[PDB]
Amino acid sequence: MNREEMTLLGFEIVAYAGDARSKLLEALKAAENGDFAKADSLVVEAGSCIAEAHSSQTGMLAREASGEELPYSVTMMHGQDHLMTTILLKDVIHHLIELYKR
Amino acid sequence: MNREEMTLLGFEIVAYAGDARSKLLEALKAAENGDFAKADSLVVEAGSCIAEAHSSQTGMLAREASGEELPYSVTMMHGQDHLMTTILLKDVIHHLIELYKR
């Protein structure tokens, strides 16, 4: 694809990763305040946002693997940063809630 | 801009991010040892280094969004990784301190 397509998709990712990010942090706030029902609900919601903007990552990487030359985009790079850090938080949040739960 | 400018800006972001991270880690060591006061101040200090490194971020996105082709730089990419991972630490640090403060 061209640079402009990569930039727009990067923006989509920045949007969804950003949304998932706020939900996960709000979940941490809820857990801090002993409101675990809300904490869990929020995490479950953040999960969908991530799954959506994530499955696109796979197809993108597979294309380069199979010979496609993908153009550089600072926006795409930025979206991936948002996505990957948010995913790490998602992968570790259960323990944070659990620690607040104990 | 040229690759040289991107690289140098990258070094700049790495320096600020690096210091922000060291302080956040140091803040953790403090909270672990009960020095919550030292931990809190350190967290505030970290935020300033982050504000600096984070500065150019929006501008870069805007330039590319308006149709400007920004050069690829490993150093810049690495700086962005440092910044973004450090910002996540900053976003979570409060809960790790609180859990230590309970």
Next chain:
Amino acid sequence: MNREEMTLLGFEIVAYAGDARSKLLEALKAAENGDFAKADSLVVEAGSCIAEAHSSQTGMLAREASGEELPYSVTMMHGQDHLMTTILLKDVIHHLIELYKR
């Protein structure tokens, strides 16, 4: 080097970081269940893999700093995201284990 070469090194980075990440997450599961000796074991193993990927990172950045032009690769940008998020987790894991240990 060419893009293909950059992509191959990136795959290597993803392998080391992905493996390290699963050990660190497994280390978290262990600590959660009170198996602290297992937790430390995994963290020590993960560090070995991280050391191999991180060392490779240093050389690359240095190559650009010395004037060398390196090709952009989505896989390398992805491997770096994996490595960088994994290094953050490794730097913060001790405090998570300790919190479960308290």
